[PDB]
């Protein structure tokens with residue numbers, strides 16, 4: 001679990017979105033596993049606007065943050081699950097690191113701010129859904 005709070009927006013993994021998220025929907029994209037809903041309070045997370053490939057992520061299954069090198073956002077094949085059929089998930093970045101299903105939503109940050117959230121994993125790898133291209137999150 002976990003979300004990004006920026007301005008009047010809440011960013012979560014689409015497969016973990018609540019009824020409230022869907023009732024206050026701004027934008028969603030199944031291919032990116034992202035959903036953005038509106039909030040009544042002001043969010044203070046800073047979104048990074050950069051091409052960093054190093055950062056730190058929060059891993060709830062270890063209660064620890066880990067430093068990682070990660071790939072550039074791209075289309076990566078993701079195994080079928082209870083939420084989606086087998087497909088290419090876009091805007092995904094992989095890193096060598098520990099992750100478990102309940103880890104989705106953990107933030108990845110670089111020195112410039114929030115980069116994305118944990119969205120996939122398996123076999124000593126962890127995948128992050130990028131949010132750096134969503135320029136509208138700041139306006």
Ligand SMILES: CSc1ccccc1CC(=O)N1CCC[C@](O)(C(N)=O)C1
Pocket residue numbers: 015033078081083084089099100101102103104118119120121122123
């Ligand atoms: C951190 S998630 C994880 C980690 C280790 C092992 C397995 C997983 C599960 C995982 O990859 N998904 C199942 C739920 C849907 C999913 O989030 C997606 N974006 O399609 C993919």
Ligand SMILES: [Zn+2]
Pocket residue numbers: 048049050051052110111112113
């Ligand atoms: Zn950066």
